Amino acid sequence: MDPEVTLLLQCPGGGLPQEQIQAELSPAHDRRPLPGGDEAITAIWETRLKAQPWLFDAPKFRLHSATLAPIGSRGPQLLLRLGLTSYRDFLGTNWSSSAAWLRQQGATDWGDTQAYLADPLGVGAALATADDFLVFLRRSRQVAEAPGLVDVPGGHPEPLAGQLVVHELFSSVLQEICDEVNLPLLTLSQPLLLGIARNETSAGRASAEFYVQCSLTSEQVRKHYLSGGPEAHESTGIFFVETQNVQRLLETEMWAELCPSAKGAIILYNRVQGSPTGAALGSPA
Numbered sequence: 001m002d003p004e005v006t007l008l009l010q011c012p013g014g015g016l017p018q019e020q021i022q023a024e025l026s027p028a029h030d031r032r033p034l035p036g037g038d039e040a041i042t043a044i045w046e047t048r049l050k051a052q053p054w055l056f057d058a059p060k061f062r063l064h065s066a067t068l069a070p071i072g073s074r075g076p077q078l079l080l081r082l083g084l085t086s087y088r089d090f091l092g093t094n095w096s097s098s099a100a101w102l103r104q105q106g107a108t109d110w111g112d113t114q115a116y117l118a119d120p121l122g123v124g125a126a127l128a129t130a131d132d133f134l135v136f137l138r139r140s141r142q143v144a145e146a147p148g149l150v151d152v153p154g155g156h157p158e159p160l161a162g163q164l165v166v167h168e169l170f171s172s173v174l175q176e177i178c179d180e181v182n183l184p185l186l187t188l189s190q191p192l193l194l195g196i197a198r199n200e201t202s203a204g205r206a207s208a209e210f211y212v213q214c215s216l217t218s219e220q221v222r223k224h225y226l227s228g229g230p231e232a233h234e235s236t237g238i239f240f241v242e243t244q245n246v247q248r249l250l251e252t253e254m255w256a257e258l259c260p261s262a263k264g265a266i267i268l269y270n271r272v273q274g275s276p277t278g279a280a281l282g283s284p285a
Contacts (some may be wrong), residue, residue, distance in 0.1 A: 005261040008196040015192030022076035024163040029064035029083035041092030060120030089118035099203035122207030126269040133218040133240035135240040139163030146259035182228040189213040190277040197264025211274035
């Protein structure tokens with residue numbers, strides 16, 4: 001529908017719980033060496049560093065692909081194939097001025113438009129309040145990507161190994177809600193995965209989008225958010241849309257306000273929907 005958003009994975013209605021998801025992490029799922037030579041990446045990084053000497057590189061999971069298993073299987077309902085990448089490779093590929101080139105050559109060379117791209121896996125949440133609102137945040141205008149736009153709560157996953165990875169992805173969305181929205185973990189339910197959306201403005205970089213229920217009402221959430229003060233969050237404001245009004249959102253004037261990744265969350269939410277899960281504190285492991 002929206003050109004800024006393509007869907008990579010759409011989970012079955014109601015979303016998928018952590019317990020039904022497996023990850024496989026392998027060098028096989030890493031970015032392919034650039035044609036020819038990764039020194040294009042170094043050149044971009046060093047250019048970025050003279051402008052911003054403090055730039056910090058960080059490890060990221062790379063999303064290679066995802067496969068839904070046949071319904072009602074002995075195995076996991078979903079398999080995520082992940083590699084490793086970094087902020088530096090992301091700047092040098094997905095946000096390279098040559099990204100469109102790289103996607104076309106990837107498709108020809110490897111039958112994969114994303115082959116030469118870092119494609120770090122982001123995360124975001126459709127965070128629903130007890131009185132049935134979704135939670136939205138106003139991005140600070142100081143950030144590099146989508147400054148000043150509306151977002152949903154995000155997160156920062158940081159690299160039996162498969163289960164630890166799946167756990168880190170799920171924990172990362174709860175952690176970010178706790179940290180950025182200033183909500184007690186007691187009030188959050190186990191997240192459900194809705195699907196994976198691509199951001200076409202960042203050369204198809206994908207984000208896993210979750211559903212998370214909060215036991216607080218929208219007014220309580222707002223009070224918790226604000227009680228931290230300006231320094232307690234990166235965003236500058238919080239607001240709420242009735243869940244019943246989220247379906248029609250792409251025709252309202254708020255749609256132009258949303259960043260690409262928040263749109264992917266909303267689209268998956270509308271298509272897939274959440275389902276009941278218990279308090280996050282109630283699940284083990």
